[PDB]
Each structure stands twice: as C-alpha cells, then as structure tokens.
Design a protein around this ligand. Sequence first.
Ligand SMILES: [Fe+3]
Length: 316
Amino acid sequence: QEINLYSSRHYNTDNELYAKFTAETGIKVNLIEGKADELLERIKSEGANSPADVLLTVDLARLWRAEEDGIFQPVQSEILETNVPEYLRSPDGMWFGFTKRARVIMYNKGKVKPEELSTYEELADPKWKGRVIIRSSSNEYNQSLVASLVVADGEESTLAWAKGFVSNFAREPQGNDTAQIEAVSSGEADLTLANTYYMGRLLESEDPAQKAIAENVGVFFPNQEGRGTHVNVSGVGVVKTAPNREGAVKFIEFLVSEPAQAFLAQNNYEYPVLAGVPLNKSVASFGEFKSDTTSLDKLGPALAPATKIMNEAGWK
Ligand SMILES: [Fe+3]
C-alpha cells in the first residue's frame, strides 16, 4: 500500500508528519513537492492516469481553483465531518482544511506601539511611508489576503489601498515571511505581514539567533473591530483519478485526528482545526483574537481581481 502525495507544504516537520502516518497505517508515502500552481498544472497535464492520490496546499483559495477544475473526488468520512468544522471543508466533500494560520502584522517593538495599529487597510496610511516590507505578490498567502480585502471592501477600494500600501514599501519585495520578520527585527523596516506560525518557529527555535530576532518583533491581530483577522488554512483533497483512494482517505483522516493535530500545533506552530487540542505555548502567548470566518467561501472567486489589483498597484 502506498499513496502519491503532491504537496505545497514546505516545512522541515513534514517528513516526520508523513512518517507518523506510515508508522500508524503501514502506508508508504511517495512525495512530490512544489508550489501549489505547479502541482495543479502537473496533475492536469498528467491525465487520467496521473499517480497523484492526494493534493495538499497551504492556501484555501488554491483548493477552490482545484475543485473548480474538477480535480477532486468526493469523500464522505465520519471522522472528517466531526473533526473538521463545516465552514472549513467543501460542502461536497472535495477538500478539507486541517490547520489554520493567521496572516498578521508583525512590528518592531522599539519603533511601534500596538496602539498605533488597527487594520490591514490602515497599512496604506501615509504614516507608514518607507516603513513597510512584505514578500512578493506572487506568493499565495498575499494573494489570498488581497482577495479577502476585495471581498470585504470591494475592488475599487482595494486597488486604492494596494497603491498606498506599495507606496509605503521600504524595499522591493524580497525573501519569504521569515526574511521579512528578520528585516523588521534588524531595523530595515518597522512592520510587515506574515503567518503566525513563522513567529512561533522563531520563538521555539533551538538557535539562539532566531530567538533573538523574535524578541525584537511583536504580533498584532488586525481588524478586531470588524470582520476579524485574515485566517487561511493548509488543506487537502483526494485526486479524482487517485490510484489508491483507500489510502488517500486514510491519509486525510490521519491529518485531522488528535495525534497529527497535536503534532502540527506543537511542532509546526499552526492552529489545529480539531477542538480540544492545545496550541504551542509560544503561539498561545500571542493572545486570543477574532478570526474572519465570513470571507472564506468567496476568496477563490476574488483571486482574479486580487492579482489584477496587485499588478496594477506595482506590487512586485
Ligand atoms: Fe508557509
């Protein structure tokens, strides 16, 4: 028994995660990693005999586009239904989220006080001129965030926001989320937007250098007075032509079960989807916050206008 996993997850803990699965079920995991868009293209180009059993992403919107293109097959699992909140899985059992991550404002403690922060929209304020940095618009975390702004504020307003946000950049987008945190820590900028688990990793690192970086940067959950902080998920679905549907289903059921949920929360610093599972202490220290649960099912359709907006605004 084996499954062919196509995953856009890119963490050093993924190997142990999959190992946990095999040690529990005896099912071998053949892994193919790459960026979400690349994996979807590969699957579609490989045809009806593609080896792909499971498609794993770190973005809800890409999962939507995958389901739209009919790449998944329905799965009805009692464990999936009970463990995964309805709003975090496909109404037709096409895909399911198994972790949650928040894209929040991370700021230099010495240069910024929390009282000066509020919403994502405010980051376009002239006050932040030459003090903001963020990774490239090509990244899905950013595209999904911009999509949520389109959904909540509209295309016209988001375009205006993006132009202002870009005008505030201290440097052109370079590096990943962690590179942004380090740059803010080093005084190259005062704030950025990154996923919570990246800060969790730095705070929990055995490398003193990483922990030192974390100490200079604080975390702020935006839009608390309104829709809430933008929350995305790491999701998964069984490919329609999966050669081993049985193993594929067991894999997804494994991901949402207590053992895997606890590991993901404790070792990869993400928010588990299963209730009753404790967060990593460092992540717990961020505090409680309101999550945006209303803009989720409309994010996918908003991808197109979001990317158009990011391009027009000059967000490289
Ligand atoms: Fe990530």
